[PDB]
Write a protein that binds this DNA or RNA. Structure first.
Ligand SMILES: [Mn+2]
Ligand SMILES: [Mn+2]
Ligand code: NA
Length: 356
DNA sequence: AAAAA
């Protein structure tokens, strides 16, 4: 019996139901744009459960016993079985507001508010936005436009590994005992991604040394002429606060970067300007919270949402990227690994490549 | 506001 929770399912990259889930993901995205959080959630949960199936749905009978499949979702599945297409997802793909929001938010530094503003000004193309002489752009948007083609081009695994080497080389220069882990999609086994994420932690660094590492590493890259964009968010981490109930950024020190990746550093089968702009996120966390941060940054987004929902509604536990708190025992639960977090929650361990 | 798993 398939659980309603993604954290009680194994979801691997062999998706047998992409015809259904691509349509459900488009409908979910449109509901996000139309500020319909409820309908967004229903389509996300339906898409998520179908992603876990070990077989493709080929008739409506195949949906029997599957949770999170309401009447609206079942009408969409039925329509796709009928002629291989979703008329509902096709109408969203042709909607002018949806097309504009996808296109405008594809720019690094452009979110829902700026995309809405430009749409209501009558803009429909990125060429017309970039060349406009009255528009004013943030430093993030300037970098988003300057390196647009490289950033919309997926990072592959040889590129992610080349970035990992750069990160590790820079980090150990200032903290030789530091542990650097590639998180996000690549840790879940993905062949491609929009960016490369890392978690950095040090067993012996002080509170100040921990604070200074991201500044030292980015200044080093700035000197090397590799830092194309850099934004460091200082930590707001509280050692003794209860975990968050919010469904939001973690409080660890982090940085959102664009690095210059020289082609010579990439060891691929295919080995222009001779370099590629790469989005890189670095997160620094205290050593004792490394398992919670790793679990939160590994994802997927839906796996994280269900993990936190399961902890709260089924175990009366409060989980986030910094800690795990037991409301019944009135104690924080410690973990040195992700396995220990799953064991505290009463969950079978789900491998990172099973969290997709 | 937007940058995130
Ligand atoms: Mn990522
Ligand atoms: Mn990222
Ligand atoms: Na964006």
């Amino acid at each position: 019996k398939i659980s309603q929770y993604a954290c009680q399912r194994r979801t691997t990259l062999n998706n047998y139901n992409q015809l259904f889930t691509d349509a459900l993901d488009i409908l979910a995205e449109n509901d996000e744009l139309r500020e319909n959080e409820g309908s967004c959630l229903a389509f996300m949960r339906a898409s998520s459960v179908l992603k876990s199936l070990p077989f493709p749905i080929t008739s409506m009978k195949d949906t029997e016993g599957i949770p999170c499949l309401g009447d609206k979702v079942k009408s969409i599945i039925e329509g796709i079985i009928e002629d291989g297409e979703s008329s509902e997802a096709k109408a969203v793909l042709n909607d002018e507001r949806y097309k504009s929001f996808k296109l405008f938010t594809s720019v690094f530094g452009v979110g829902l508010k700026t995309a809405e503003k430009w749409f209501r000004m009558g803009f429909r193309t990125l060429s017309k936005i970039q060349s406009d002489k009255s528009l004013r752009f943030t430093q993030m948007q300037k970098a988003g436009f300057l390196y647009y083609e490289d950033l919309v081009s997926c990072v592959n695994r040889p590129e992610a590994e080349a970035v990992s080497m750069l990160v590790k080389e820079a980090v150990v220069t200032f903290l030789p005992d530091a542990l650097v882990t590639m998180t996000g999609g690549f840790r879940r086994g993905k062949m491609t991604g929009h960016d490369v994420d890392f978690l950095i932690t040090s067993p012996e660094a002080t509170e100040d040394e921990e604070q200074q590492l991201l500044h030292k590493v980015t200044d080093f890259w700035k000197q090397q002429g590799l830092l194309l964009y850099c934004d460091i968010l200082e930590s707001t981490f509280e050692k003794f606060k209860q975990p968050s109930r919010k469904v939001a950024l973690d409080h660890f020190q982090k940085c959102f970067l664009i690095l210059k990746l020289d082609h010579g550093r990439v060891h691929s089968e295919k080995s222009g300007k001779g370099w590629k702009a790469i989005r890189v996120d670095l997160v620094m966390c205290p050593y004792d919270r490394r398992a919670f941060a790793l679990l939160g940054w590994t994802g997927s987004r839906q796996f994280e949402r269900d993990l936190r929902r399961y902890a709260t509604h089924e175990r009366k536990m409060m989980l986030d990227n910094h800690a795990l708190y037991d409301r019944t025992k009135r104690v924080f639960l410690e973990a040195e690994s992700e396995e220990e977090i799953f064991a505290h929650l009463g969950l079978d361990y789900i491998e990172p490549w099973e969290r997709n």
